């Protein structure tokens, strides 16, 4: 390749789901004394449900604490100075935007579509009277943006050094130079093409927001976790119209027409049928929590390795060669913006494994041997930048009979003119 490209990509991950609690007696009996006294000779099928649901509920906070509370020193966003030509305005928080969240986060919170007791006195009040309650998360949406604005303000100021100890400042260009040097290319390639790369990054950031503004199905993973947790609670209430073999599904039309010995046969069918629905609900919630947990662990690993460092793992932090990442918070999830280096318009060349000068075989230290038809040069393999074959580009080993495709050329001694 002879030129390159800077590409910014997006990845979206669920981190947590809603926390619920169920009142056994209110769902089954419903402020009846004939019932809830028959539902006492049944077993302990109501403490064992609220143990499991609380185990689910208290884990959704560890999920968030693992992903976002990576570092617990709240670094402050510096008054935007010059960063070499890079413009981090759409991702750093604005003073005037609500809840001090950035432009991109404001775009993200609108797409995903998520009652006081004075108002219930619809379908939320119908499930509030039957014992089903939704608890609030511990870490609010303003305490997560402050973690994100510190993760994003330590990395554009110190680099990779604040996820391994104390933060050490460094100019941004001299950080991007080391990041370039970590993927194979050398420093002068960045130091001589700084304006072009700054413009490419600034023009690639200004396309993610345009994509997010005219595409409804952008955050599709984060909507299907809020749809299912509402579908389950809506099914649990619709399941109260079923008479599981009883004469009626209403508990006040059995207690007003039959005497206790003749009523306990229908009440004991309704009780048995209404416990099964609760058990099914709990089992399905336990099964979904195990996927949300895996996604939270993946997001924590990705935060530790793509944001606080620079990964060599292929396709782990985007497509291409990884340079850096920036996190943004989305409701019940996380969004990573990955920056990658993609090679570009390339050219054909003729190659050789070694050079036979006068009875020796010279091999290249770093790059490869190429020919423009009549001359031989040495380049680096990820960017066409030719040089002259000397004794400080190569090293000697053996003779010119074991290497298969060895060619004959000259090697210029650097200190022989002197």
């Amino acid at each position: 390749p002879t030129n390159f490209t800077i590409s910014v990509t997006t990845e979206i991950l669920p981190v947590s789901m809603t926390k619920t609690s169920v009142d056994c007696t209110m769902y089954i009996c419903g402020d009846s004394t004939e019932c809830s006294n028959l539902l006492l000779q049944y077993g302990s099928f109501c403490t064992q449900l609220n143990r499991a649901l609380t185990g689910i509920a208290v884990e959704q906070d560890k999920n968030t604490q693992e992903v976002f509370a990576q570092v617990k020193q709240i670094y402050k966003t510096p008054p935007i100075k010059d960063f070499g030509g890079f413009n981090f305005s759409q991702i750093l928080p604005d003073p005037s935007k609500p809840s001090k969240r950035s432009f991109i986060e404001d775009l993200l919170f609108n797409k995903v579509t998520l009652k006081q007791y004075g108002d219930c006195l619809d379908l939320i009040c119908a499930q509030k009277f039957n014992g089903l309650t939704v608890l609030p998360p511990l870490l609010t949406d303003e305490m997560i943006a402050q973690y994100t604005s510190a993760l994003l303000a330590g990395t554009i100021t110190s680099g990779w050094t604040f996820g391994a100890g104390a933060a050490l400042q460094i100019p941004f260009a001299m950080q991007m130079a080391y990041r370039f040097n970590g993927i194979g290319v050398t420093q002068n390639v960045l130091y001589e093409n700084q304006k072009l790369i700054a413009n490419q990054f600034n023009s690639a950031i200004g396309k993610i927001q345009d994509s997010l503004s005219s595409t409804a199905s952008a955050l599709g993973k984060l909507q299907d976790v809020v749809n299912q947790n509402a579908q389950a609670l809506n099914t649990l209430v619709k399941q109260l119209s079923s008479n599981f073999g009883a004469i009626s599904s209403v508990l006040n039309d059995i207690l007003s027409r039959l005497d206790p010995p003749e009523a306990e046969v229908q009440i004991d069918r309704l009780i048995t049928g209404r416990l099964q629905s609760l058990q099914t609900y709990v089992t399905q919630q336990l099964i979904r929590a195990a996927e949300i947990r895996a996604s939270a662990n993946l997001a924590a690993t990705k935060m530790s390795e793509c944001v606080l460092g620079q990964s060599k793992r292929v396709d782990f932090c985007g497509k291409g060669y990884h340079l850096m990442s920036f996190p943004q918070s989305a409701p019940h999830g996380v969004v990573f913006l990955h920056v990658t280096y993609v090679p570009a318009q390339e050219k054909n060349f003729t190659t050789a494994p070694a050079i036979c000068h006068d009875g020796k075989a010279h091999f290249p230290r770093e790059g490869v041997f190429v020919s423009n038809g009549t001359h031989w040069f040495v380049t680096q393999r990820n960017f066409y930048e030719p040089q002259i074959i000397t004794t400080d580009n190569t090293f000697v080993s053996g003779s010119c009979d074991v290497v298969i495709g060895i060619v004959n050329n000259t090697v210029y001694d650097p200190l022989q003119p002197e």
């Binding site: 020193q73 305490m143 933060a167």
Partner: protein, 92 residues
Amino acid sequence: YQDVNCTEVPVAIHADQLTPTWRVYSTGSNVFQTRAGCLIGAEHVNNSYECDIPIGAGICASYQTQSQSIIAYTMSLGAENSVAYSNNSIAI
């Protein structure tokens, strides 16, 4: 109390048919309106410590010895810090 005002607790729980011992957890002088309901029985401080008993919506509670009482507060994210950035300065 999960989703009620701090002036509608007496009417939401029917605080007139309850025992006089239950009727002390529905009155004033300690009411505190969090974003996750009304909290009664906890003294509200203005500092920020680490979370001890998580209540929710950013509010935690603990049992301190100011003699002894339960205090509710807002949890702290961490220690504030700042880093001196410039275009010709490194630290090694």
